[PDB]
Design a protein around this ligand. Structure first.
Ligand SMILES: NC(=S)Nc1ccccc1OC(F)(F)F
Length: 171
């Protein structure tokens, strides 16, 4: 059975208990913490691509009101995010299983862009999700996994200074 684990879940949970925030810029900003996934149970000899996307966790615009994030009462259906391909893709199962798969180079933006960068809507809440795509073989297959621990709100600047301090402390 294909097993997918989050690496450093301890640390993600410290961000989640404050409500995590990720900066978006026009040029794109790398994530901290980095999503790192432990994968076992692949066919070491089969070929896979690792894809990352961001599900809109709800339809609401969020605002930091007097020290607390609060959703609005004007939600709308959210266009789904673009998919980032892990730059090691495509690769053998053995490649993916020898170390945590680290999405260190994805950049989060707020603007339609040259490509690579993933566009999010500022002040929306997102749940990172991966797709493991068995490629090249006769039988294509997809295993998907969500990481609730890694939920965040996309922001143009940090609102909660406890997040700012945690980001620096652990970077
Ligand atoms: N989920 C997506 S958008 N996958 C994808 C991305 C880039 C090229 C091809 C892709 O899918 C295909 F291989 F199944 F066609």
């Amino acid at each position: 059975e294909l097993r997918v684990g989050l690496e450093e879940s301890e640390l993600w949970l410290r961000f989640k208990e404050l409500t995590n925030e990720m900066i978006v810029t026009k040029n794109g900003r790398r994530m901290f913490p980095v999503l790192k996934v432990n994968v076992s149970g692949l066919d070491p000899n089969a070929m896979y691509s690792f894809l990352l996307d961001f599900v809109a966790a709800d339809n609401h615009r969020w605002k930091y009101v007097n020290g607390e994030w609060v959703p609005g009462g004007k939600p709308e259906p959210q266009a789904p995010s673009c998919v980032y391909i892990h730059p090691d893709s495509p690769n053998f199962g053995a490649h993916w299983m020898k170390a945590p798969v680290s999405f260190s180079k994805v950049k989060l933006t707020n603007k339609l862009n040259g490509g690579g960068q993933i566009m999010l809507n500022s002040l929306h809440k997102y749940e990172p999700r991966i797709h493991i795509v068995r490629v090249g073989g006769p039988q294509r297959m997809i295993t998907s996994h969500c990481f609730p621990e890694t939920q965040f709100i996309a922001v143009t600047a940090y609102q909660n200074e406890e997040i700012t301090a945690l980001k620096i402390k652990y970077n």
